[PDB]
Design a protein around this nucleic acid. Structure first.
Ligand SMILES: Nc1nc2c(ncn2[C@@H]2O[C@H](COP(=O)(O)OP(=O)(O)OP(=O)(O)O)[C@@H](O)[C@H]2O)c(=O)[nH]1
Ligand SMILES: Nc1ncnc2c1ncn2[C@@H]1O[C@H](CSCC[C@H](N)C(=O)O)[C@@H](O)[C@H]1O
Lengths: 255, 284, 255, 255
RNA sequence: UAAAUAUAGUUUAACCAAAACAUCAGAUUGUGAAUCUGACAACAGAGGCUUACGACCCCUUAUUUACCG
């Protein structure tokens, strides 16, 4: 089971990351919330008890992640699970002829830096910490779970920057899984659909309720708790490796 | 050639002599310039036939044994194609080893110190040594350094591998290991080294001198290492084994199997399993 | 949770089907082993206690399946979960030039009859049985889990018939999930890799070690209990619909 | 180039098959229309000149295909290209709770036989004929092109049978390409979506005119000539093998 | 310094005389490929003897044991 496991959840101060920490801590594990200093993770870490600690770090910087993982090693002594839930999004068309508006290169680079570069930066440094762990009875040293929404497969209009970052995570899931196979680290990717993250609840009820009704079944936005359940299922199953799992309620995004 | 002037009564004389000889075999006979050397070669040439026919006689005796039983006497997931599949799997692993694997160097600069018998035997150990690397979970990146293209050792390797020589996933080169790797990371393994190998180091290049001196020539590998400025190490055979019998210079197939076990986190207890048990009375 | 649910498991007398029944019955659910009369289903159902019964039926026959579904209703009163693990494998090259041998059509038809046709025959009949259920708090009426294979994505030499039947299951999983979404029935598919089923364990030890070594991590054949674990996770997670999950330890089969 | 090649077009009396024969014959190749006796293929063969001949055969019948292939051998001497375009469709849904209607088993069987089993029947028999050809300068003996559908990926409601058969073709395109690789035969799959075929004219015109607007670009129905152009492209490219090419104008099929 | 020994893939056997297990190349193997066709078979080394031999005698290197009225 997950009892006694130490999990580092990036972007754990809100959204999918926070839901993952509540389930894992509630199941007896220990969680290290890695998020931005202004994300308010300290309040969330205090609510989750002494088994959860907040490590303020920016995933785009190698320095901050190294200190954050040093804090995780100090507080709990080992790292067993890495859950990459940190992410941003930008809604901008590639090119609008009616408006003469072009997608800004800074916007495209910004999304890649957090979603794609930040995920790999966490993975490459975390794999060093799971490499110090002794293999268990099954020979496993740790589990890495990435988040890359269904936009990686069927992105919508104006989601080119976001799909490029999530497409990158999906594409590199298998090579990293083959890279860490000698070590004993499992790399898995989850593709959430439309979830009731604070991002989706922000937009007006018109697009909120319409999109919730666009899911075949269940006809609602995904509960972040349901994301946490599938995260725990991956941890508990020794044979899940190098696979992308769609958690969307069978919805295929139309243009 | 007049060299028949010896064989044509040495058969009648009562000594063990083969019946089928060729000019190529006859040529190598006249390099034997003494009675004992010729007798020793003829004894080897005679026993070649002795085990050939004995194994020859065995195989068609089996042919009659199976053909009577074979002629008188469903749902599957995979076609029986495993030997092909295993070779392909080892090929992918070998290709990965040639890019990210730890380099291991076999020094071919011992051609001038070996007789024909020893040079041929070196290839046999080389064939087995490279075979064990292919089947390993984490293969080395095997280098053949100081291997002259036209040299005697190269020609024997080509003859044995035939077509496979150009397809092997190893780097054979004319240059010395000092040209390919920094001189600090090179550790020339030799039994005469005063430094005992304590732990297997994954950031080092281990050099094994492909030298099989049945006429033992101590210090040859050490001289080459000290001719350059390379560091040397020796296996802790005395530390972990109670030696009684035989030379402490192991073969090339034993050495690579010891290194492979160490590289896979095995301890010296498991690694020294490959030292022949006839030479010691148990691990301590 | 799965306690109180009734599961119909085709091919549940051995292999993955038997492992699924053992876990679900152990967790507190009731199971119906739907397998051929000649299989050891009667012994297996007895071994699992009074919560598991054996319903002899051939999945290729509509009449046999309907009698099995009637038996599940008689013993337990309702059907909650359907697991389609029944299937056969045939290895045969499409055409062999040196040997002059051409793939036999009857070999193709029988594999398609059990794997593809048999899976859909259960799906269309068991869907009507779940259509009689009152929806739970989430509005769900049942979960249908199909068992494809990794051959549906990278089939090996000689698996033309097997891959086609398993590829069709991957084909139907989303359209059927769309058909049953108004009803409230989720359809999901699992694609196991190399597993320790009697089919693989009967092979010589020489090739068994090779197959285990081909899996990147863990370097062993899949435990049937791991398939059962993922089946339970799909049942408990309400947001998994119309998705194929590869459970193969990141293996990609070579030609 | 395709000049001088002999192509066996399966289902070449109408739709995609007729367009493929129209282009290949115009480019200088020889065609054999393998279709049903009542399809009117004799008129099409006469209209295409002496380079096209009609072979009345049912793809599900082994005897019919062998006689049809022997006719191509007699008329043209060799078989160089095989294009599988014959296929049927069904619009029945898996289960309808409101009407108590279940997808009848014979509709699923009939679609599977013609689409999946019929395609494999032609593939294995044409593989023997292609195996008699002398390898060309590139070592190639022939090219086999299969026609899956977009429904193999995102099939709509009431397309369970069609998606199953089309998913099977996508599933087996790689193992057959691996099976026939030593012989020197390339297997490639096309997945058209919403083409201006008689199939997309049986549906109601208002529905059909609506789907033409659903395609992102070109916002129209696919011209069968565009399918014929892609078939020629696959023939002339020696490195296209074992891949499924979607030809749909970037449409993703909604439920 | 002396006596014992010394298997170049590994063991066994030895005046039996060659095994058993391995190794290399080729193989599209229909599930005994559990096979077939080839490659390599040097009992430390170099010499003497002897009708010969692995025996016998010097010598070289090495290993393990012992080593001063
Ligand atoms: N009793 C005894 N004498 C020993 C021992 N070790 C060495 N010796 C003696 O030391 C001698 C050394 O012989 P060599 O090695 O030929 O002598 P060297 O003076 O080194 O001469 P070179 O070999 O020509 O370099 C032996 O012959 C013995 O007389 C030992 O363990 N016991
Ligand atoms: N005990 C040992 N420790 C480390 N390397 C050894 C060894 N025994 C043999 N080797 C390696 O195996 C190879 C063949 S042994 C031959 C060594 C050489 N003829 C000499 O007399 O010095 C050598 O290159 C040596 O490096």
């Amino acid at each position: 089971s997950v009892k006694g496991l130490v999990a580092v959840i990036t972007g754990g101060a809100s959204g999918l990351g926070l839901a993952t920490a509540e389930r894992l801590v509630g199941q007896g594990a220990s969680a290290v919330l890695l998020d931005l200093p202004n994300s308010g993770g300290e309040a969330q870490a205090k609510k989750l008890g002494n088994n959860c600690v907040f490590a303020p770090a920016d995933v785009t910087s190698e320095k901050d992640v190294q200190t954050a993982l040093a804090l995780a090693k100090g507080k709990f002594g080992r790292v067993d699970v890495a859950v990459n839930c940190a992410g941003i999004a930008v809604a901008s068309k590639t090119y609008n002829l009616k408006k003469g508006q072009t997608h800004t290169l800074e916007d495209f680079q910004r999304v890649l830096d957090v979603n794609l570069m930040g995920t790999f930066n966490v993975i490459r440094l975390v794999a060093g910490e799971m490499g110090q762990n002794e293999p268990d009875q099954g020979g496993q040293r740790g589990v890495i779970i990435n988040t890359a929404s269904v936009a990686a497969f069927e992105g919508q209009v104006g989601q080119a920057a976001y799909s490029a970052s999530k497409g990158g995570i999906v594409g590199m899931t298998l090579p990293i899984a083959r890279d860490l196979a000698p070590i004993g680290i499992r790399v898995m990717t989850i593709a959430p659909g439309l979830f009731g993250t604070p991002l989706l609840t922000s937009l007006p009820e018109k697009v909120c309720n319409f999109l919730a009704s666009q899911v075949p079944f269940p006809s609602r936005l995904g509960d972040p708790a349901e994301y946490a359940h599938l995260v725990q299922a991956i941890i508990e199953n020794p044979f899940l490796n190098g696979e992308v799992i769609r958690l969307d309620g069978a919805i295929r995004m139309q243009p | 050639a007049a060299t028949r002037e010896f064989i044509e009564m040495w058969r009648l004389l009562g000594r063990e002599v083969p019946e089928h000889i060729t000019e190529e075999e006859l040529k190598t006979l006249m390099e034997c310039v003494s009675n004992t050397a010729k007798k020793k070669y003829l004894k080897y040439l005679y026993t070649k036939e002795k085990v050939k026919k004995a194994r020859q006689i065995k195989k068609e005796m089996k042919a009659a044994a199976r053909e009577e039983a074979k002629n008188i006497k469903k749902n599957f997931l995979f076609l029986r194609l495993w030997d092909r599949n295993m070779d392909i799997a080892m090929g992918w692993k070998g290709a990965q080893a040639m890019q990210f694997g730890q380099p291991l160097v076999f020094d071919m600069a011992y051609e001038n110190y070996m007789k024909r018998k020893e040079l041929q035997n070196t290839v046999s150990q080389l064939l087995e040594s490279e075979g064990w690397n292919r089947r390993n979970v984490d293969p080395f990146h095997i280098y053949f350094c100081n291997l002259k293209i036209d040299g005697a050792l190269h020609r024997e390797l080509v003859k044995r591998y035939q077509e496979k020589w150009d397809k092997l996933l190893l780097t054979s080169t004319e240059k010395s290991h000092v040209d390919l790797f920094p001189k600090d990371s090179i550790i020339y393994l030799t039994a005469d080294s005063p430094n005992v190998m304590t732990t297997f180091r994954h950031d080092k290049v281990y050099v094994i001198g492909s030298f099989v001196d049945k006429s033992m020539q101590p210090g040859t590998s050490l001289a080459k290492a000290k001719r350059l400025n390379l560091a040397t190490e020796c296996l802790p055979l005395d530390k972990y084994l109670q030696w009684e019998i035989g030379n402490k210079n192991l073969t090339l197939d034993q050495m690579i199997r010891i290194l492979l076990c160490l590289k896979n986190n095995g301890n010296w207890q498991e690694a020294l399993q490959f030292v022949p048990k006839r030479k010691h009375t148990g691990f301590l």
